Amino acid sequence: RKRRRHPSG
């Protein structure tokens, strides 16, 4: 399963 970062905003 794809784990990803999440940008602010």
Added chain:
Amino acid sequence: LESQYQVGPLLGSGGFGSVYSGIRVSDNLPVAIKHVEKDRISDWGELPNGTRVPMEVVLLKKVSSGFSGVIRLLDWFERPDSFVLILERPEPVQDLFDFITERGALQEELARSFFWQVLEAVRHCHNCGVLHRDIKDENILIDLNRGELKLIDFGSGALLKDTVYTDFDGTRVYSPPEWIRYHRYHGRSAAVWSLGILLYDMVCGDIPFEHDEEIIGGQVFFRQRVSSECQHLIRWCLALRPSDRPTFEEIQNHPWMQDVLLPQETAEIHLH
């Protein structure tokens, strides 16, 4: 400014600006050098001297006195179009997002030690009148040698207050359902929600929610084996009604939180 620090490689860039590795020539202290363009700065403030600065500088100075689990502001400079911040740099270091990506779901003993240290650091911010508003694994650095966690990036923060907040520029997948539904939240209770997301992230290997509907659905499915005591703490932090969430004291008094490892012990058992 340009002759007090020897600039090195780019460590990262994004919504926060561009952060470089560097070394203070005065004593070879490892530092991080963060650049923020003036035109990209949303919230401005002023500190004692009455000089107008980005709010991030105001918040960093308020939390940067003495020792803590917050990365400290050592110095800062104004340029024609930008502000430059000199920050502590642990060495060796890895951020908590990469750590979890590589190791997977963390043993509960290790998640307890990490989460405890995050709690002490956020308590410290709130004692100093600062609300971080962007607690997540990406904004947490691990000093691999000392086993200490360090909070970074106050660029979405605010002064702590007891009235409602109606603005938010943190990470949406860590924001609480009252923000998704109504664009309103209170500081401490919204922080606790993001801490629930962080604890789930540590013990399951990834955050529980990706979509608005999941955030406001308030159903927590556990994708890894997690103890009943830990599941209970997580579900409590992720209560849909803010007033149903625990205080920071209730979190640290929870049975899952007892007998935390020391930082040194944590590094020796789990990091070295």
